[PDB]
């Protein structure tokens, strides 16, 4: 790790990606460390062997190297060099002369001349690179300079490098290497770092196309990758064979002196089955083994063989449990039938085909190719039982493991699932039946802090290095740590996991609540002074509208495509009409919702508040600019944690990703919620808290305001107001705590909101990230490029293969629009709720339980957020309760009993005298006669007091 | 109705379904009630008559 | 079918039984269903074309397989199978359209 590898490059046949994360196959085996230290002109010949004069470092296996890589560390100067490639067929050399003359020096001309045997040939270099920083070669013969591959040689037995450098610090490396599977991070098309996909955790990480996957749950399938025993089962019928054999005897007179592909002594290649009448030979016995047959005497470097044709079934594999209704194989042509070609290669350099094997066939269940040559009256049914295997059972193939079962099921012979995969079969012999379990069912694993821990499995076994496999209902679970049940660092509804992977059952949230206080003339407790708290919510409010141009998107600028589309304007008009009308509708709504008050916007000055110091919420002043308002602190923190086309037809930069989309035809409109009027709205709402009805326009101290809001819940009756002064110290502290949380259940609430915001943003992006990808694939056409399609075809057959592109593209587009309408029609509900609660909680305290916070509600702040709002519901929670002894009513000496005018009050005997308090606060109020009401019938269960002591309680007379 | 038909079976070229409800074509015409009562080795030749 | 073994059947003859079988169930709940009763017999055939005084062309072919039985040695050996042709072939044998 930490290797710069500035020279080191990627390899790509096609266009290179830039600044992306990509997993791929690269030749990155360290092999010999250097193998070229002190490189001189006599570099020698190395042939994919450990025969490299260098320090391998002992990490090199030295078995074989798939490719050879040359890394050059020289100043940017031209130094004479030659390249020699040795192959059995021929020796090819690369030379370049600085001087104008073709011979030049041993205008720059480079000639590579390749000579085979005693014949010498001359080749043309053509383009010559100004500077080459890296060189790549391979055994296959692919040639790569700076990643792209110019051309591929047929084969290379050995490679010799003729590079001569006077400089002692000649170069950095010429090494061997092999393929591997890795991941890479690329910036400006240049590598930054890589990750070998060897360990299980690394495997998952690479699969994630990212690094540092967040702690959570993932699924994996570990699969065996080796040959397995093969099992076959068929219906027993005494095999009657048919052998089809063919005798290709190419036997030419070498072919290296004049021509190999000239078909010399190529002649008779035939199979005994031909008839003088030469009726097509179709087998009758079901069992037949097709075989290629013997081959002609083979000489060095050249051969001939059969090739796959256009038929469904490849010859040679036909014998592998195939079905057919009528083979009818013929040597000459057969009407309406497939044919195959045999070709010959001279050192994989000449290809000459021969008309061979006309075959036509009917489908059927009678004829079936059998691999095993022996066919006769014999008993065989190989069946490996309890291991992973391949299988062919009654013409159905697959892989898995076989289990004996006990089920009569004498109705039939094969049982298949709804999906089409067979589940079990019954032997013809006796009646036993066997199930077919799949080899590797998916396993569920867990990761935390970028390491794997714990695992949900299916088998009572320790697959990984975990030391314990605790059996649990509905599943098994492995873990490598003891059980101490300290706490949970991850959770799911049923259960949570410990830090070390120990599993724990969740205990739901311990809470407590209150209820009606029935008058009972007995001991009861009322809440005393409370403490403040803050709760955070988030509501989706808007969706970034998108608009599409039908004709750009599908036509892509071809006039003929536009004209073929011209007859479909009835169709695609509806798409853009719907999108446009919906966009203007929703934008009209969101613009109708945003009010403003200049009277109150000025009040947002922090000097007006007091000890609360809600600095974060208040909008920022203009930064020496003529801007009405600026985003608040919690605003840019949120945005931080989370182009002009003007520059997309002009400029000198390469186009950006967003810019590209415009070219294709998608077009994201500017968002409805712009910052200027958004901030004015938020600031006006915030300033509506400190403004109360006054004859003058001036403000009043914030402290008085809170008291008034409290009066709403009940008549605060104290003259020295301790609450105003105590709750602020908790309030500003809670606020600093929660802004720190941005940069205690409240904490999990904030985590939930943040998770929801990143959720909606991902949900928005990957919609068009899915859209713009589908035009890269051609549904049925030869190629995606309409222009290329026109180039490759004349007027009659070009439009015919064109139109099936647009027939698919329109469907994809209609899918996209039908899902966008389904996003708008649903977000409208969230808009309704948001407008329904902002004007309720934000403006006037609610008496509705659970709508504004856990408990009684005082006031709420609001700020903006991506496509949404965020609230700050300040509430009250009881610190302690005060007990007290009450009376459910009063009885005078006369029959008349008195009660209270409204329920929310309650008498009690505080001391010698009686005091009547509120039911929701401990504030006490003086007794008086006006607070009572008369009812004739006296209940004994109340206070029993006569008219005499009545004067002692209320001054009646 | 109420015939047990324990011996009676379905006919399927492909894999048989189990414990399902299926509508299909079957050779279920009553035709001759029995036509084989007291079957002996000399059953004779019957040709779709 | 229970455990791949028959339990009972329902002939699809009556209209109600037809609907029931179509429901892939028994005892369909009381309600509304849709049906299409269709005639299944030959019907008179009617033709109409643009009137143009018909000028004909007859293409006829004379396959005359006539083998010597074929049950004694081979039928698929194409014996006396030979000439099968239609008068329209040209000595130049340009495709006849
Ligand atoms: C630009 O475009 C060119 C187009 O040609 C790309 O070049 C091709 O790249 C592909 C993919 O890398 C390459 O296929 C691979 O070839 C190598 C070499 O093949 C020979 O080695 C194997 C052993 O691995 C030997 O069995 C035998 O010598 C192989 O040759 C044979 O190939 C097939 C398949 O093996 C045989 O049936 C033929 O008979 C023929 O003789 C292989 O290393 C690589 O093999 C991997 O896949 C095969 C098939 O599934 C599998 O059998 C191997 O075991 C191996 O799979 C995994 O096994 C290793 C074990 O170490 C494990 O570590 C990894 O998980 C492996 O994936 C595959 O066959 C192809 O040959 C190239 N073209 C030519 C003509 O050379 C070029 O890459 C492109 N560049 C880019 C990316 O832009
Ligand atoms: C396993 O796989 C095998 C594969 O072979 C399945 O066997 C095949 O099963 C199918 C379906 O049952 C079967 O097709 C049917 O054949 C019978 C017999 O055909 C002959 O009878 C008709 C009268 O019904 C005569 O006209 C004539 O003799 C028929 O023979 C002719 O077939 C066609 C069509 O008729 C002719 O054009 C040819 O010239 C040839 O001579 C038929 O009873 C059945 O006919 C039904 O459909 C046809 C076509 O629509 C229609 O014309 C018939 O009137 C009838 O339709 C309805 O009419 C009756 C009137 O009583 C009505 O009650 C019902 O509504 C009928 O449905 C159809 O042709 C096929 O022949 C079998 N294969 C072979 C080669 O024999 C086997 O079933 C599979 N088993 C399973 C399920 O696993
Ligand atoms: C993927 O590759 C890119 C390219 O190297 C990585 O981004 C680069 O990351 C480095 C730190 O790893 C950034 O450097 C930091 O930049 C700031 C701001 O300039 C500077 O103050 C710091 O001292 C430090 O230099 C660098 O800006 C950044 N460049 C680009 C173009 O992204 C990225 O981290 C890699 N990711 C992975 C997972 O490998
Ligand atoms: C509104 O929700 C909050 C958070 O869920 C509630 O806060 C918590 O109230 C519970 C009482 O239901 C407190 O529980 C107790 O704490 C004491 C002291 O630690 C302990 O001795 C008790 O055994 C019990 O655990 C809890 O401390 C308190 N937590 C916080 C962070 O305030 C609040 O009560 C809810 N209000 C209503 C009306 O449900
Ligand atoms: C479709 O076929 C199945 C198979 O026969 C029918 O289910 C069987 O229905 C019978 C009654 O019709 C059930 O018998 C009842 O079972 C209980 C519990 O064992 C027993 O106490 C009763 O005395 C009576 O025997 C039987 O359990 C049930 N078996 C199975 C495997 O389903 C089903 O009713 C048929 N449905 C139609 C629409 O034909
Ligand atoms: C899981 O537990 C196993 C043993 O219970 C730990 O294994 C040791 O790991 C090191 C590093 O590979 C080996 O050298 C030791 O031989 C292992 N011991 C045994 C007995 O196998 C393993 O490290 C634990 N891993 C985690 C993540 O807990
Ligand atoms: C490399 O080429 C030079 C001429 O360019 C030649 O003098 C030298 O001998 C060659 N090296 C080998 C090892 O043949
Ligand atoms: C490379 O080593 C192998 C194994 O010894 C050998 O067959 C081969 O000949 C060596 N390379 C050359 C170019 O000889
Ligand atoms: C090109 O080929 C000719 C003919 O074989 C040869 O004389 C000449 O040296 C070659 N050029 C090189 C090797 O640069
Ligand atoms: C690159 O070449 C310079 C030339 O002097 C040398 O000093 C340095 O070690 C080389 N770096 C490598 C090979 O990484
Ligand atoms: C096919 O050709 C080869 C060589 O031309 C000859 O040996 C053989 O007898 C020929 N006939 C058969 C049936 O192989
Ligand atoms: C099938 O079983 C026999 C008996 O053990 C064995 O000789 C033969 O090799 C087996 N075939 C395969 C493909 O394993
Ligand atoms: C037989 O099968 C039944 C259900 O398939 C199962 O409950 C039982 O354990 C099996 N074995 C025996 C001996 O009954
Ligand atoms: C599961 O494995 C444990 C390991 O000792 C063993 O004691 C237990 O019997 C096993 N249970 C089953 C059902 O295999
Ligand atoms: C952890 O385990 C130790 C030893 O079993 C025990 O003494 C301790 O109380 C446990 N603590 C927690 C937090 O589980
Ligand atoms: C939470 O609830 C469980 C449920 O029994 C109880 O045992 C425990 O006392 C509670 N713990 C806390 C910290 O509230
Ligand atoms: C509860 O009420 C009883 C009256 O029966 C009284 O004696 C007692 O003091 C009361 N409890 C408290 C804590 O005041
Ligand atoms: C409630 O009031 C008592 C007495 O005034 C005081 O001691 C206590 O600290 C107060 N609690 C809170 C949370 O303000
Ligand atoms: C806040 O008010 C004070 C005086 O009331 C004033 O000096 C200050 O400029 C005001 N702040 C802003 C941003 O206008
Ligand atoms: C109080 O206001 C000042 C004014 O900028 C600010 O720096 C400080 O952080 C605020 N303190 C709290 C607790 O909000
Ligand atoms: C060069 O390119 C950069 C970015 O592509 C651009 O900012 C600059 O104006 C261009 N021209 C010069 C002279 O740097
Ligand atoms: C009235 O007094 C009786 C006395 O027995 C009592 O049971 C009842 O609850 C009382 N009803 C009220 C207070 O409404
Ligand atoms: C108060 O209640 C007591 C207990 O029943 C009763 O004896 C007495 O008469 C009552 N006094 C009144 C109603 O003034
Ligand atoms: C039936 O076969 C038996 C021999 O297996 C033979 O004796 C008898 O005659 C046969 N029946 C008829 C009707 O030919
Ligand atoms: C069946 O009856 C028909 C009608 O009479 C007749 O053509 C046929 O020959 C009878 N069957 C046999 C086997 O004769
Ligand atoms: C076709 O062949 C048959 C028999 O071979 C013969 O009778 C007839 O004349 C031939 N020609 C034509 C035109 O039918």
Distance from CA of A396 to the nearest CA of B (A): 11
Compute CA A380 distance to the chain's CA centroid, rounded to the nearest angstrom.
50
Please return the burial class of A634, using the count of CB atoms within 10 Å of its CB with bins 0-12, 13-18 and 19+.
buried
Q: Name A714's Cβ contacts closer than 8 Å, sequence gap at least 6.
A: A904, A918, A920, A921, A923
Compute CA A804 distance to the chain's CA centroid, rounded to the nearest angstrom.
30
CA distance A470 to A454: 11
Nearest atom (ligand 23) to Cα of A946: 14
Kind plus residue range of the DSSP H or E element containing A687: helix A675-687
The total of other beta-carbon atoms located within 10 Å of residue A289's CB is 19
Cα of A403 from ligand 13 centre, angstroms: 14
- Nearest CA owner, ligand 21 atom 8: A652
Closest residue by Cα to residue A838 from A856, A829, A825, A851: A851
Report which DSSP code applies to A329: B
* Chain C interface test: which of B8, B12, B23 (most C C-beta within 10 Å): B23
Nearest atom (ligand 4) to Cα of A512: 12
Cβ contacts of B6 on chain C, cutoff 8 Å: 5
The total of other beta-carbon atoms located within 10 Å of residue A257's CB is 8
Closest residue by Cα to residue A324 from A368, A281, A280: A368
Written as six digits, the tokens of A122 are 């001359």
Distance from CA of A764 to the nearest CA of B (A): 44
Q: What residues does ligand 5 touch, defined as CB less than 6 Å away?
A: C 2, 7-8, 26
Measured CA to CA in angstroms, residue A363 lies from A324, A334, A340, A356 at distances of: 5, 17, 19, 22
Among all chains, which residue has been given the structure tokens 């100067």? A77
CA distance A856 to A878: 10
Cα of A435 from ligand 13 centre, angstroms: 14
- Nearest CA owner, ligand 10 atom 2: A73
* Chain B interface test: which of C2, C3, C4 (most B C-beta within 10 Å): C4
Q: What is the resolution of this structure in A?
A: 3.2
Written as six digits, the tokens of A556 are 């892509």
Nearest atom (ligand 11) to Cα of A265: 5
Cα of A460 from ligand 24 centre, angstroms: 62
* B18 interfaces chain A, CB cutoff of 8 Å: yes
Confirm if A20 and A156 have CB atoms less than 8 A apart: no
Chains that touch A (3 or more CB pairs under 8 A): B, C
Pairing outcome for strands A45-46 and A158-163: antiparallel
Q: What is the DSSP string of chain B?
A: -----SS-----SSPBP-S------------SS-S-TT--S--------
* B18 interfaces chain C, CB cutoff of 8 Å: yes
Residue in B closest to A395 by C-alpha: B14
Distance from CA of B46 to the nearest CA of A (A): 28
Cβ–Cβ of B18/A415 closer than 8 Å? Answer: yes
What is the CA angle A546-A547-A551, rounded to 5? 145
A484 lines ligand 15 (CB under 6 A): yes
- Nearest CA owner, ligand 4 atom 9: A511
Residue in C closest to B10 by C-alpha: C6
A621 lines ligand 19 (CB under 6 A): yes
Residue to mutate (ligand 3; options A187, A206, A210; most atoms within 8 A of CB): A187
Confirm if A609 and A690 have CB atoms less than 8 A apart: yes
* B3 interfaces chain A, CB cutoff of 8 Å: no
A883 lines ligand 17 (CB under 6 A): yes
Cβ–Cβ of A415/B16 closer than 8 Å? Answer: yes
* B21 interfaces chain C, CB cutoff of 8 Å: yes
Distance from CA of A289 to the nearest CA of B (A): 26
CA distance A838 to A169: 74
Residue to mutate (ligand 1; options A65, A140, A184; most atoms within 8 A of CB): A140
Strand order across the A21-27 sheet: A21-27, A179-187, A190-196
Cβ contacts of A412 on chain B, cutoff 8 Å: 10, 12, 15-16
Please return the burial class of A473, using the count of CB atoms within 10 Å of its CB with bins 0-12, 13-18 and 19+.
exposed
Measured CA to CA in angstroms, residue A401 lies from A220, A438, B15 at distances of: 20, 6, 20
Cβ–Cβ of B1/C12 closer than 8 Å? Answer: no
| Contacts for A825-828: CB closer than 8 Å, 24+ residues apart | A827/A540, A827/A542, A827/A543, A828/A586
The total of other beta-carbon atoms located within 10 Å of residue C80's CB is 11
Cβ–Cβ of B9/C9 closer than 8 Å? Answer: no
Distance from CA of B24 to the nearest CA of C (A): 10
* Chain A interface test: which of C1, C2, C3, C80 (most A C-beta within 10 Å): C3
A414: nearest CB among B9, B10, B16: B16
Cβ–Cβ of C77/A277 closer than 8 Å? Answer: yes
CA distance A939 to A891: 7
Cα of A501 from ligand 16 centre, angstroms: 22
Cβ contacts of C5 on chain A, cutoff 8 Å: 411
A406 lines ligand 19 (CB under 6 A): no
Phi and psi angles of residue C77, each rounded to the nearest 5 degrees, phi first: -90, 0
Cβ–Cβ of C5/A279 closer than 8 Å? Answer: no
CA distance A634 to A862: 11
Q: What is the DSSP string of C15-75?
A: HHHHHHHHTTSSSPPSS---------S--------------------EE----S-SSSS-S
Kind plus residue range of the DSSP H or E element containing A68: strand A67-71
Kind plus residue range of the DSSP H or E element containing A186: strand A179-187
Helix A569-593 with A795-841: angle, nearest 10 deg: 20
CA distance A435 to A401: 8
Please return the burial class of A282, using the count of CB atoms within 10 Å of its CB with bins 0-12, 13-18 and 19+.
middle
CA distance A469 to A318: 48
* B36 interfaces chain A, CB cutoff of 8 Å: no
Cβ contacts of C80 on chain A, cutoff 8 Å: none
Among all chains, which residue has been given the structure tokens 């600019």? A625
CA distance B24 to B9: 13
Kind plus residue range of the DSSP H or E element containing A818: helix A795-841
Phi and psi angles of residue C13, each rounded to the nearest 5 degrees, phi first: -105, -55
A397 lines ligand 9 (CB under 6 A): no
* Chain B interface test: which of C2, C3, C6 (most B C-beta within 10 Å): C6
Compute CA A898 distance to the chain's CA centroid, rounded to the nearest angstrom.
72
Beta-sheet strands, E only, within A794-953: 857-865, 868-878, 881-885, 890-891, 897-900, 905-908, 915-918, 924-925, 932-935, 943-944
* B7 interfaces chain A, CB cutoff of 8 Å: no
- Nearest CA owner, ligand 16 atom 8: A510
Residue to mutate (ligand 21; options A18, A650, A653; most atoms within 8 A of CB): A653
C89 lines ligand 26 (CB under 6 A): no
Cβ contacts of B14 on chain C, cutoff 8 Å: none
B19: nearest CB among C2, C8, C21: C2
Please return the burial class of C68, using the count of CB atoms within 10 Å of its CB with bins 0-12, 13-18 and 19+.
exposed
Q: Nearest ligand, CA of residue A81?
A: 7
What is the CA angle A850-A853-A854, rounded to 5? 75
Cβ–Cβ of A422/B15 closer than 8 Å? Answer: yes
* A417 interfaces chain C, CB cutoff of 8 Å: no
Closest residue by Cα to residue A300 from A352, A253, A347: A347
């Amino acid at each position: 790790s930490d290797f710069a590898f500035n020279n080191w490059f990627l390899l790509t046949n096609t266009s290179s990606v830039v600044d992306g994360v990509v997993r791929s196959f690269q030749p990155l085996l360290l092999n010999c460390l250097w193998s070229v230290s002190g490189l001189r002109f006599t570099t020698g010949f190395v042939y994919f062997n450990g025969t490299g004069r260098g320090d391998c470092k002992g990490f090199s296996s030295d078995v074989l190297s798939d490719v050879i890589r040359y890394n050059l560390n020289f100043e940017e100067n031209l130094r004479r060099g030659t390249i020699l490639f040795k192959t059995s067929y021929g020796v090819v050399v690369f030379y370049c002369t600085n001087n104008t003359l073709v011979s030049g020096d041993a205008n720059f001309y480079c000639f590579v001349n390749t000579t085979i045997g005693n014949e010498t040939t001359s080749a043309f270099v053509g383009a010559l690179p100004k500077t080459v920083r890296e060189f790549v070669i391979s055994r296959t013969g692919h040639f790569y300079i700076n990643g792209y591959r110019y051309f591929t040689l047929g084969n290379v037995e050995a490679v010799n490098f003729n590079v001569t450098t006077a400089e002692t610090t000649d170069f950095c490396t010429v090494a061997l290497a092999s393929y591997a599977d890795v991941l890479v991070n690329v910036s400006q098309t240049s590598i930054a770092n890589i990750i070998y996909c060897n360990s299980v955790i690394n495997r998952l990480r690479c699969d994630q196309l990212s690094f540092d996957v967040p702690d959570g749950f993932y699924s994996t399938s570990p699969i065996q990758s080796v040959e397995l025993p093969v099992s076959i089962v068929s219906l027993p019928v005494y095999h009657k064979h048919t052998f089809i054999v063919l005798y290709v005897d190419f036997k030419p007179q070498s072919g290296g002196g004049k021509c190999f592909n000239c078909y010399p002594a190529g002649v008779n290649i035939t199979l005994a089955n031909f008839n003088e009448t030469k009726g097509p030979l179709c087998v009758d016995t079901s069992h037949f083994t097709t075989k290629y047959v013997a081959v002609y005497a083979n000489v060095g470097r050249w051969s001939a063989s059969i090739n796959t044709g256009n038929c469904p079934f490849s010859f040679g594999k036909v014998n592998n449990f195939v079905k057919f209704g009528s083979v009818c194989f013929s040597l000459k042509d057969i009407p309406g039938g497939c044919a195959m070609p045999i070709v010959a290669n001279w050192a994989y350099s000449k290809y000459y085909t021969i008309g061979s094997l006309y075959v036509s066939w009917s489908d059927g269940d009678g004829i079936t190719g059998v691999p095993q040559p022996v066919e006769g009256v014999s008993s065989f049914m190989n069946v490996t039982l309890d291991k992973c295997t391949k299988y062919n059972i009654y013409d159905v193939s697959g892989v898995g493991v076989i289990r004996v079962s006990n089920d009569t099921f004498l109705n039939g012979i094969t049982y298949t699932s709804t999906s089409g995969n067979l589940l079990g079969f019954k032997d013809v012999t006796k009646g036993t039946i066997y199930s077919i379990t799949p080899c590797n069912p998916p396993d569920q694993l867990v990761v935390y802090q970028q390491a794997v821990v714990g695992a949900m499995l299916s088998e009572n076994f320790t697959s990984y290095g975990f030391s314990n496999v605790v059996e649990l209902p509905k599943f098994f679970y492995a873990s490598n740590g003891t059980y101490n049940c300290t706490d949970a660092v991850l959770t799911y509804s049923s259960f949570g996991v410990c830090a070390d992977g120990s599993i724990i059952a969740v205990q739901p949230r311990n809470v407590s609540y209150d209820s009606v206080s029935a008058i009972v003339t007995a001991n009861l407790s009322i809440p005393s002074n409370w403490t403040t708290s803050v709760q955070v919510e988030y509501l989706q409010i808007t969706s970034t509208p998108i608009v599409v141009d039908c004709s750009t998107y599908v036509c892509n600028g071809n006039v003929r495509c536009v004209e073929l589309l011209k007859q479909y304007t009835s169709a695609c008009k509806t798409i853009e009409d719907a999108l446009r009308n919906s966009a203007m509708l929703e934008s009209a709504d969101v613009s109708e919702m945003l009010t403003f008050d200049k009277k109150a916007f000025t009040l947002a000055n922090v000097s007006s508040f007091g000890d609360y110091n809600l600095s974060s919420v208040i909008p920022s002043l203009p930064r020496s600019g003529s801007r009405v308002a600026g985003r608040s602190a919690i605003e840019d923190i949120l945005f931080s944690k989370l182009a002009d086309y003007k520059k997309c037809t002009k400029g000198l930069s390469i186009a950006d990703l967003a810019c590209a989309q415009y070219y294709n035809g998608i077009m994201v409109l500017p968002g409805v919620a712009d910052a200027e009027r958004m901030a004015m709205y938020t600031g006006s709402l915030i300033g509506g808290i400190a403004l109360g009805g006054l004859t003058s326009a001036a403000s009043i101290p914030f402290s008085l305001a809170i008291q008034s809001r409290l009066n709403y819940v009940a008549l605060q009756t104290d003259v020295l107001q301790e609450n105003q002064k105590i709750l602020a110290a908790s309030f500003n502290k809670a606020m600093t705590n929660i802004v720190d949380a941005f940069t205690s259940q409240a904490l999990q609430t904030v985590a939930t909101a943040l998770n929801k915001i990143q959720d909606v943003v991902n949900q928005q992006g990957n919609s068009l990230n899915h859209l713009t990808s589908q035009l890269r694939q051609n549904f049925q056409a030869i190629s995606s490029s309409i222009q290329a399609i026109y180039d490759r075809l004349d007027i009659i057959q070009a439009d015919q293969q064109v139109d099936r592109l647009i027939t698919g593209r329109l469907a994809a587009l209609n899918v996209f629009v039908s899902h966008t309408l389904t996003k708008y029609t649903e977000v409208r509900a969230s808009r309704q709720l948001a407008q329904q609660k902002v004007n309720e909680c934000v403006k006037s305290q609610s008496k509705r339980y659970g709508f504004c916070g856990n408990g009684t509600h005082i006031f709420s702040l609001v700020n903006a957020a991506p496509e949404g709002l965020v609230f700050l519901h300040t509430v009250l929670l009881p610190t302690q309760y005060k007990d007290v002894e009450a009376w459910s009513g009063l009885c005078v000496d006369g029959r008349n009993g008195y009660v209270l005018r409204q329920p929310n009050l309650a008498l009690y005997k505080e001391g010698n005298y009686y005091r009547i308090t509120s039911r929701i606060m401990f504030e006490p109020r003086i007794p008086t006669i006006a607070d009572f009401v008369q009812i004739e019938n006296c209940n004994v269960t109340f206070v029993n007091i006569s008219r005499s002591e009545l004067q002692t309680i209320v001054p009646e007379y």
